[PDB]
From a paper:
[name] removes heme from hemoglobin and transports it to downstream Isd proteins, where heme is transported into the cell and degraded so that iron is released for use in fundamental cellular processes. [name] binds hemoglobin and heme using widely conserved NEAr iron transport (NEAT) domains.
For [name]-399, we found that labeling of the NEAT2 peptides QVKSAITEF (residues 324 to 332) and MVEGQRVR (residues 396 to 403) reduced deuterium incorporation in the presence of Fab. We projected this epitope onto the surface of NEAT2 and designated this region antigenic site 2. The canonical F54 residue on CDR-H2 of [name]-399 still interacts with [name] but is removed from the heme-binding site. [name]-281 reduced growth when added to the medium, while an inhibitory effect was not detected for the [name]-399- or [name]-229-treated groups, in which the OD values did not differ from those of the group treated with heme alone.
Numbering used by the authors:
A (entry chain B): 1 to 212
B (entry chain A): 1 to 226
Amino acid sequence: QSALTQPRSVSGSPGQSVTISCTGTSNDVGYYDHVSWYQQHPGKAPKFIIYDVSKRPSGVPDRFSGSKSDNTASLTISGLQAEDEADYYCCSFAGSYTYVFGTGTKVTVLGQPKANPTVTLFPPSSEELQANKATLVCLISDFYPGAVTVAWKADGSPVKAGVETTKPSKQSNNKYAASSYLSLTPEQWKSHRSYSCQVTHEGSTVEKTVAP
Amino acid sequence: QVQLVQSGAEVKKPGSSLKVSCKVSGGNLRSYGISWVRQAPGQGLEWMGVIIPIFGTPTYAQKFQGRVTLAADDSNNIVFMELSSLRSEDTAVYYCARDWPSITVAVDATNYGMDVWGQGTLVTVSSASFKGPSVFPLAPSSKSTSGGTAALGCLVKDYFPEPVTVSWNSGALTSGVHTFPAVLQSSGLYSLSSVVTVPSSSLGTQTYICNVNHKPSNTKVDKKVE
């Protein structure tokens, strides 16, 4: 079956309330009252937090609450704390010993002011050029929230092929960092006079430029 | 205090068969049911099947019907999941979870709820061969220098499989260090970066060496960044 429909992301300040929607069909969410929710922190296993639409297992704080309406279940976190920043998945019994999981929702707790990103662009190293390879490495650091878009340009024209970008990861100082690579060959790297890595964060763009 | 202990990580080629085990401690498996949920890297949870040993033959999700099997060893409190004809899209972390999709009494558990989860089993499916990485220095420049500080790093390129560990000055340098997660390229090999922001006063005096360890290939590389 198709996965239950959840919002991609959701955010709120400490002390605020947030709601995750979970839309299924009349054969699962709208049929049974067996909707469960699960919290997953980065690099860890999911955690049982909600079952039977609105029942909380032993130990889960009453900050979390559940509800259902037609084919849409909802999870509410009332009084966001830094620990609540995680991924959340809904799940519903689908009949005949089967379950269906939701697409998952990222909960962001905006407990830190906006930080503008620092962009560092490295040209292909002389060591890699001898290996008949040329990789441009764009490093973005110290930005909050952790959401950026990276675009590459060569002499002003956009470059999308050969681009690989990591999702933002938390630094040691709780800010976020991201990396993007433009993998070429020395011949293709020498065929353009200037390369640009543009990073858009919260509506503002930052650009770094290198030249062969 | 029931706990689920899963088998270790595994690297397998396309066309082979996977076998992961889930061992129950602190309770009897005959009173429980076990679900299996997998999660591709950076993706969501996906239910695959469930087995209740006291109720007989298990049930599988439709997209896995024909290449997944579930079996239980009641005397050893362990269940097994076998996924056959592995493809690259089967690369995921495979969890087991105590479950009871039943109206009957869930002994020490919860009806229609996955309450106890295992630590997960990382499974990589790829045609690539074991290969150590090539390390390249990301030298500091005038474009990486601003306000008495400068950024330098190392490019760890083309290795398989995960993971690699990066340190700076044998682990003595940790302030300002950030090692990025790896990217999976079209070549089937991984690549990541590790950068460190460093005062510009020390660039001419202090030595900065990144230490890269790829234990699957027993490759250790030290690269001075000048």
